[model samples]
Target: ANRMILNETAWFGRGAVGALTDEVKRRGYQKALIVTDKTLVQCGVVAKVTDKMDAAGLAWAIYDGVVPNPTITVVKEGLGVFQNSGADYLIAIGGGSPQDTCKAIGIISNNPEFADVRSLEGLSPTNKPSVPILAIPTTAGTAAEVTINYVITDEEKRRKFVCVDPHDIPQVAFIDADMMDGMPPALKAATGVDALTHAIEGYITRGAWALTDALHIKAIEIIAGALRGSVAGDKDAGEEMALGQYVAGMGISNVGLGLVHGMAHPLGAFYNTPHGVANAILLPHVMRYNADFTGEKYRDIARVMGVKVEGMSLEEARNAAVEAVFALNRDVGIPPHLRDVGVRKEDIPALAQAALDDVCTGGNPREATLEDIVELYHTAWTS
Candidate 1:
């Protein structure tokens, strides 16, 4: 069965966070555990959402233990607060880290046996749905609010585990660009390109079908148009990206993604490289590698990104697609090589092994060998 899963309800607009009051009330959720990071809490983004929650008389207990790339220990720490807070549901407030941690807590709360955390890697057989979750995205990227998968790092093992569970999808999501307005330009660049990666990988992945293809292509179009302006602090562009990333997430979450994600995860685990930065750096390289296997999709990508694919040869169109992506990364200030992000020359072997084992690898259009992954890592690092 080709499965399609999404959050129960989603609201998108400039001020969509306001919808949270009605949705929470309608769902009859009492108190909430606000899963977030200290930065969000201190910088007042958490307060912005809770201000409305307060207006609605919605009680909440805040847990700001989430980190940049959430780890098993981080989630476990948040779980301690969640289990004891007596909050009936969860509200995630940040980019991917807090939201991913929120999903972990909710999933483990209802399905206690996966408390070991590592067992949740790949596709675990968790029978129960997660504790009710309401997600509010503070960045115009990642779309952790909508995705069915969440990544958590295992610090001891030095690898990230992707947990795929439909049960982890939020019950409600608010995609308000107002919440994202305070992001630094650097963040906007990294996360926006990450969204583009999601769409491109999903569009070309093995399991992609008509429904997901439509979503991914549209997401690519939206991100390509809006990302530059979004990084430059345009409100309208930010709103477009807020929707674009969620759209990409909706597709990739269901259909899986290609080698960009497959290789990107290892970088995150190894160097604590920002997830979006790793993806942004690896996207063009992976696209170049997978060009021949992507069929006509590269033409679609090139055309949508404003490359004139007219009168171009198949290989020419493919190069245009890859170059178009690299151009976007360049414009957004993403460094072209993994070495720019503290990735050492010596770590290629370990990173390649992790990428080969990453669950997202199976969805790549071309089958990647260990040597193939090793060379890709080396090339990404030095070239």
Candidate 2:
């Protein structure tokens, strides 16, 4: 059975956010509870959206309590804001955290039975659709705006739980490069690789099919071509990245991801590692581990990333794919090893156990056991 779900509409390119006003008016949404973090507000990125809202007489209330690895407490707090503010909808104005937080608020607001937050994990049974969300991405990573997945960190458990609910999808998404332009080079590289990881993982994932293949490969090509230039502050490349990440999301949201994301999530839960950096560090290692199971997918991956894999053996092509990713991570300034990101030696077993249990792990091309996950974590740590 194949099924695909996506936003009703998406606007892409440089000034795509300019359409926010007309769309809002057409929908008749009264006041929005804006989901974001302090950084975006302080950096004036939030103003760019709200300034236009003001001119158009669109109303919103800010809930800037989201953090990098957002927690259940954060969701409850944002839900409280949404309740008291009398906001009719949600507008997410940051990266994955805000987007995820907004989804939680929207879901719980509409489906109040799951208000405890933890019950939303693992293919949520939410019957009611989320309160409408209009997502404007401030980072090219995560594609949370486009994906049906929202991960919320359970601080008490020190683990992040994946919530899959088609009902949580945004009604509209704005892939505006203008909002992403001000991110530093390191951030561009990190988030761009995260997009690449999504495309690559989705391509080789167990549920992958022809249609999602088309999206993943195209996303990989665009991301590979544009990530470096985006990191170098090229506006055109940044715009391409904005488009690429959303495309990747469109695919993964329908299918799923793989072991790279499986292992990466624990790092965020355990150490509060930046999601993109964690993915970047683990991606190549997990790719190599999953290579024997992935068939010729890696050749497509290498080729899209500009590797000359036409005449090579399957083995050679796969190795080239790993190298290609390694080069991109190096050039974009992603740290080479897990230790560089502060994952501890003692936490490997617990991390491995959590990874073995992750929703994304079920989609890995190669199935992983607890021991295998532990070894992969060690390999990535020191490599």
Candidate 3:
């Protein structure tokens, strides 16, 4: 197999927005088209970066029309906005929706053949790097700032599919905790839990090597340590989460992920559920299913998660790990069941099949059968 990778040139924390002006001048970019959402723009989160642009004398225009789960049309519209604004680069802000949409807009602008958007699913045959993008994330989850992947909703298929293109990675990132501190309690809870899931899932994925193990294990520890306090409006904890989520991103971006993401995508597509909330609810049940396939990793996870297994067998330690996850999820206000998220019984089969087809399924440590997935879904149905 061949290998490919991409990451930002530099990242700044806390007051990184200040670096934007010098970076813009140094890079010689004359104008920018910023992609974001209405809520962020109205909340002045988008302005935090744009205001830096103004101080640097960089001309720009805003495309704040992206919605929760961005559609193909959003990409096309953003491309038009980019062209009309005569911008040479993009500064994407907001959560996954706007960040992913901005990446799509940047990619399709350079390779017009994938202008249809649907054709960009999986790996596309695009012949060029996306327009240079400077990504700024306003949420702790969906570490689009560091990863080489982006997800888009297929309006026709009624499913979300991932786009993996090394060419589409952001050229720069600013992962400041200050940008994310304004998230509401619910967003904080959901996104923090999602980072926990990513850390745990990445730790056990098939391709995980010693290097990735270090990152994933540390990510798990930091996420577990910070998630609860972060959601309660603790600044230091929020700072840890800002980096913890990105640490999880660094591992999963390379080693891979597991069934929680596999199952979570369908909920985002079918029910319009927030990706983080779906993963939070599905995580514990998925952990139980994957436990046996995990070898000693579960014991390590238990230790990092603060489970006291002074002298326990692997099985007991593993169960402690699972319970620790459950305790954290409950403490953060995540519901214990899929039904609480409005998932219906009749559609379980369809959702299971979609989960089976998700690209992340390949890396799951456990080889899940269709019946196994059904059982897992049923377990999550009531938590």
Candidate 4:
């Protein structure tokens, strides 16, 4: 049985963009197209790297049109910009949307047949490797900087679908905490919680192995301790968030994420809910749903979350960890229900079916039926 993983060759610290000059010359790349969002470009996050590019005497162009739930249209537009720029390599900055959009651009550039963009979702059949990408994350969550997956929304269908392709992984990454310090409090709270969800789900997902267990447990510890403080603007905590999210990414990318992500994707596409906010609100509910099937993983999560799991029976400690996740969600300002995110009851069935069809659903710790999904959605709707 062969499993695939796509990861960066070398990841540098807070000021790593400084190393890109040597990387470019060493890798023998010619020109670069930087993919990001308008706000990042305006706020100088994109400039942080392009400025380094200028100093390296590297030729580059920026495409800053990525939207929150990037779509096929976003990909086409970014691809056009990158194609016109005549760049051979890509640098993805900002958060998930930009990183995802960059993958679409790189994938389509190498496999022109998927240029329509809609055909790239799921286990992509792309025969060629994407143009080299250097992902510089400016946010502490999403881990799109490290994951082999990307997502794009379908506006007409009102669904966000995941794309899994080993070729889209960045050749190198810069997990710079200084770059993440500028995030607003709400963004920090939301993304930090999202990272926690990843750690939890990745650890308990059915495909988890001894190798992935090590990464996810460490991520759980760091995220549990640092997320709230990071949301409150602690620099040390922000650095942990960056690394913790990436460690979670390392686990989930090869193994998988569980039900929380399966259920959150459609809500974001349909209602424009922020990805992190949707994940944070649903994390506990889904975690509890999968709890019975998780064996000893929850005990470790509880221990990592600073619970005194060592003194309790496995079942008691596991439930305590799940409750702690809910407590954290409440503290982070995540609303308790889908109603708060503008989702109507009529939408649940359709969203539930979409979740049933989601790629992540297959890897759930406990297999969920459509009825289970409907019940879970309703539970999340009103809980």
lDDT of each: 0.91, 0.94, 0.87, 0.86
- Score candidate 1 by lDDT: 0.91
Leading candidate by lDDT: 2
> Lowest lDDT 10-mer window, candidate 1?
374-383
Using all chains and alpha carbons, the TM-scores for the candidates as numbered come to 0.99, 0.99, 0.97, 0.97
In model 2, the runs with Cα more than 4 Å from the true position are none
Candidate 2 Cα deviation (angstroms), residue 184: 1.2
Residue 114 C-alpha lDDT in model 1 = 88
lDDT of 3 by residue, 109-133 (tens): 8998898888898876779999999
- Clash statistics: count for each candidate: 0, 0, 0, 0
- Reference-based lDDT, residue 264, model 2: 93
Number of residue pairs clashing in candidate 4, backbone atoms closer than 3 angstroms, sequence gap of 3 or more or interchain: 0
Q: What is the per-residue lDDT of model 1 for residues 66-157, given as tens digits with 9 covering 90 to 100?
A: 98889999988899999999999999999999999999999999989989888998786889999999999998789899888999999999
Q: Candidate 4, after superposition: displacement of residue 349 in Å?
A: 1.0
Whole-model lDDT for model 3 versus the true structure? Answer: 0.87
Q: Which stretches of candidate 4 lie over 4 Å from their true place?
A: 2-4
Model 4 Cα lDDT, one tens digit per residue, 1-383: 53757464756467766777888899999999989898887887777787778988999988999989998899999999998999999999889999999999999999999987779988899999999998888877888987889999988778898889988989988888877888998888888888887878888888888888898899999898988898877888888888888887887778998778999988898888898998988888888888889998888899889888867988898789889988888776778788888988898889888888988888899999888989888888884
